[PDB]
Write a structure and sequence with these properties.
part of a larger assembly, 4 chains, A: 184 residues, alpha/beta, 3 helices, globular, C: 402 residues, mainly alpha, 18 helices, elongated, Phosphodiesterase_MJ0936/Vps29 (chains A, B), protein transport (chains A, B), Metallo-depent_PP-like (chains A, B)
Amino acid sequence: AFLILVIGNLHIPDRALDIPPKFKKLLSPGKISQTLCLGNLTDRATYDYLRSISPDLKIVRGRMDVEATSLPLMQVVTHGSLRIGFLEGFTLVSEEPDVLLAEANKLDVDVLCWAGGSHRFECFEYMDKFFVNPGSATGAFTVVPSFCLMDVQGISLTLYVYQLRKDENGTENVAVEKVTYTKP
Amino acid sequence: AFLILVIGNLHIPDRALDIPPKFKKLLSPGKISQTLCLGNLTDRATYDYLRSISPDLKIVRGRMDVEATSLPLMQVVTHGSLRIGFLEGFTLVSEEPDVLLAEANKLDVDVLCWAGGSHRFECFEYMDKFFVNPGSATGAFTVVPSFCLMDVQGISLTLYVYQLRKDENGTENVAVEKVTYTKP
Amino acid sequence: GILAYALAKVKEHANSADLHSQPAQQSLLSLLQSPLRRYVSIFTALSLPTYVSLFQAQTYPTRRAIAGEIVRTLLKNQTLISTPAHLENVLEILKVLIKEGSQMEEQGWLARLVHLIHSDDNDTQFRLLQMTRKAYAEGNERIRTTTPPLITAGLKLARRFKAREHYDDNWSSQSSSLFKFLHSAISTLYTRVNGPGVADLCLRLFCSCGQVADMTEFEEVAYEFFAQAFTVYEESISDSKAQFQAVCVIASALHRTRNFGRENYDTLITKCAQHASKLLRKPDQCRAVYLASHLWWATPIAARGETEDTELYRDGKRVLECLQRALRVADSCMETATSIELFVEILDRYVYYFDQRNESVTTKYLNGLIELIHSNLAGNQQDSASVEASRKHFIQTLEMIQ
Amino acid sequence: RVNGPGVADLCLRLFCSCGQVADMTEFEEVAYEFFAQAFTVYEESISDSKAQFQAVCVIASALHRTRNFGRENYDTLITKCAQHASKLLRKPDQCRAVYLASHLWWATPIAARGETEDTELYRDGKRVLECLQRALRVADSCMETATSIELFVEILDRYVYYFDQRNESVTTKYLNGLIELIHSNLAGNQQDSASVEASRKHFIQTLEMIQ
């Protein structure tokens, strides 16, 4: 149903270069419902493109994203009544677990997507929460670009994380793992 | 002959308030030849007035003078071939003798008028040079306002320092002392 | 044989039907396309250079349109691969590029190049690198975005490079030069007074490189640069948001860097914090101030100095003082609501230090805080969504904190 | 009251007046914040070379009859003023000051003290020399010579000050290196200049002057 794309690490056409062809294939307009974007675009053309994906670019700047095309720093979104959070992660100064958990409260958010400094692309449940770097998602870096199509059901999110692995499959290889989530 | 007014400490109508009536009497236009001004005016009206004194406001800003009406920081003037220097003194960070002497060289100046921090109004010959705070000269402060009418003869200056002392003479009391000067 | 041999001949003869886009041009173009279109091996054609010289007599609009087209196609995917020559070619063309009408996918161009690079020697790049920087002198107007892919290209290479040295050990040289090169270029750049966002960008570049300098060794050169980086933070950043992002980088950038000691630091720390304490944006400000605790912190690697030479930033005093100052932000609140959300937050933080073996730290304040949150939380109330929320938060927390 | 050009300058001078008055009068407690604020003004919101020129002379100076903070406040602050100073980009002014920053620790005088500590001069060489070395770095990064020498001389004049200041730590080897260096450039290279005449007058003055 809901096709909420969750995506990390980019900097186009910078850390993430092209749009991987499968991404190029994948991402046609309006179709995707919501883009939850974890900043550092860097580019505007690409910004126009984020728009071009879906009917929503849901936006929150990064610390390797300057100025603002019009960027709104943090934004909380509700689907169901999961407050599904994103920021590029900038607000941090400490990647430590309790911090992640805390952070979720400060913003009134309960699922956290962030981008790391060694440009993390790692998510794990720790304290019932997922602290999520969907990180690399387009070819960015500190190889698995990943982003998720998500179906958020209430406070709970079920994520099928689609992972793109360069492999001797001679393709951008999609491996999907589903992880299911409940917000407290 | 030359009526070069040398004047220190002001800030009008600030530290120095009014123009002392004798100053008011004293200073009519064009008549005075050159004004060597040691900054912190503060005022422009008064700037127009400095102009109004003589045919020359010879100007060099102070550190209790902001922006610039048009102010030229330091200026060296020659009369005879005394390079007669003034600045408000701002360039300093150390009132120490050898510093004064040095300073004279750096700017290519050989007579130094400056304004102090405890708003000095003191001049003495030390190392053949006069390091000069004609300081208070209009009612300013850290009571003797003083300024000089000077006749510069070459490298040498003879100063008749006119000193204004409030006294039970019931006047702004003029005491003149002449000090004679040679630049090396 | 056409190209010079009719066509150049012609071209000197006729500047008498002449170009920009007229049908002669068109023809010239089409013709020009003709290889290309047929091609799979356009390269000998750039050795045809009647052609080349002939680019001059094209308009810039058309130079891009074909040449660009070529780039673009080659960007759709490149045909054939390298030799030295092609670097040249690249350049000939680059010369068409940097100027050749004016100071538009030059990004996309940037990208190919940026790609194309990794397989060969130090030098190629260098030649190029060099050329290109010089080539960057031609702008003043699209640029902000345009220098960085190169920055990255080098950076990546630079790590890839860091990832190879035992024959090269002249990384130092390369670097040195390069950083210098870069630096020099960089100093150039800011100074190319030109831009909004300059500060932000430059900085991010400082960061990238600077940090790279952290991981790679060369700290020597760092403080000046860094001192400069901060300056940018002070002068020439100017928006709350811009700042918001940027200081997160300063802090963070500092956070995976660790080079300076304490020495550099006492001066610097007091200052960042001061700037921080000279920011005037409250939500953000307290959270950070208490977060400044983490600067000395055992967690982690950031909390160290190699001027000293290795390990955590042991000792309580500043850490608490930071919390006390964060608390001062709290103190100077007056507006309560946010104060509590924060207090709680601080409390969450308190739980962190409970977990951090914050030894020096004594319960009396923790007690004073839990009590204080409660006192406000309960002790006063009015119409708010927030009152509902506060309970949800309270609930969450209590389960969470153990 | 966002309003104004000159705001920074003025406010500052007011900070100074009052702040200093606060120095002479006792109440230092409240000072650093204010001062920290004062500096901010110096960093953001001043913006002209001249404006700055006057203003930092005040910062330095204002600091110079104030003395309240210690070293504590200072290490952070000193590195910074100097840094701003080192982040100014106006050369004549910049070196002279940098070597002048020596006076911050200096036995001359009252300014060179801290009451966070509670009384007397800012004893110890290291920074003082480093300042001269950095001033020297400005010299180093000169490349444009002429002004470099006028300055070198000037530094030399300064050297004479420290000769007089019992700059104990300081050892002749640099003084020697400087007098020699001034001479080397002074003599060793020449071209059409008024300045070449002047340099002699200066040289003359100096030699008599220095004893």
